[PDB]
Every structure is written in C-alpha cells, then in structure tokens.
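Narrative of accomplishments. A recurring question from our advisory board has been how the design workflow behaves on a single, concrete structure rather than in aggregate. To address it, we present the structure tokens for one chain from the evaluation set, followed by the sequence designed for it. No filtering or post-editing was applied between the two.
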C-alpha cells in the first residue's frame, strides 16, 4: 500500500538526485504517496531519495496535527549565519536512531511547489534543521555521516536488527 523506505547502509541512499524537469501529474502522485508513507511512519520529513526515486523532491509537515504539509522541488538552501544550533535528529532511513547534529541556525530556501511556482522563504528553528537534513538526502548524505565512526557503526548494526525484526513481523 505505502512506498518502501530505504534503510542505511543501502548504497542507493548515496545517489545524488536529478532536478525535476517539470511538475507533471506523476510527480504530483509521487508527492502524495511520499506524504502517506511519511505520515504512516510516522515522520516529519521525507526526501524522494529515501523511496528510491532520485529526484529533487522533498515532503515535510512539521505540525502536531499532521495538517501543515509543505513541498520543496529543486531546492536551494543558503545559510544566513555562522551560528549553529544543536538538534537531536532522526531519519526514517536510519530507523529508530537519534543523535545530535549542529547546523547553521537560519537559512534561506528557494524552491518550487506542486504548481511550478517559485518561492523564497527564510527559516530558523525546526524548519532550518529539517530542510538542511532533507537537502543532504538529495546529495547522497545521511545525518550519521556527521557522527564519529563508532556511533555510525553502532547505528548500522542496530538498524539491520530493526529491519530484520520488521521483516519477521510481516511473517507473523
Ligand atoms: Zn532523513
């Protein structure tokens, strides 16, 4: 029913995504399936790289109510300061692992929406964390890449265990 999410260390998560050529109704349908997948997980961010569609498309909803959806197509993110903020990040492609990352605290976002309109906004807080995390997906990067090798290694061993439990849960 839902789209499968790739899990670390799947090598396809390292693919650099291609620009979206036109917001066609198949990219519209993909965005809608990404939302269902994301909301089911549950998560607040999913990049199209994570469902093995190597395209610059990101869906996001940062709200308690699952009612404030946002789409970023072909995004450009530029920091507006050297000040960073720590945040404990997770990732649906690194399931059930969370750790601290430090990223620029304020950024400018330029992207297009599901109608092909351009927009430009400035983001701090959770938005700035999340858009930078998701942009990293589109350049083949995961948040575990900023951790020490032992923490990455532990994360990898734990995730294979969770994925193996998830499969076993399908047989029951
Ligand atoms: Zn992620």
């Amino acid at each position: 029913a839902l789209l499968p999410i790739l899990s670390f260390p799947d090598p396809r998560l390292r693919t650099i995504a291609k620009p979206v050529e036109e917001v066609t109704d198949e990219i519209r349908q993909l965005a809608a399936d990404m939302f269902e997948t994301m909301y089911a997980a549950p998560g607040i961010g999913l990049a199209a790289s994570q469902v093995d569609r190597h395209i610059q498309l990101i869906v996001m909803d940062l709200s308690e109510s699952k009612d404030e959806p946002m789409v970023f197509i072909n995004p450009k993110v530029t920091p507006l300061t050297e000040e960073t903020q720590p945040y404990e990040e997770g990732c649906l492609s690194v399931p059930q692992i969370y750790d601290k990352v430090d990223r620029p605290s304020r950024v400018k976002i330029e992207a297009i929406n599901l109608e092909g309109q351009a927009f430009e906004i400035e983001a701090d807080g959770l938005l700035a964390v999340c858009i930078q995390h998701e942009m990293d997906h589109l350049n083949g990067k995961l948040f575990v890449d900023y951790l020490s090798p032992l923490k990455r290694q532990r994360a990898r061993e734990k995730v294979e265990k969770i994925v193996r439990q998830r499969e076993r849960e399908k047989v029951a």
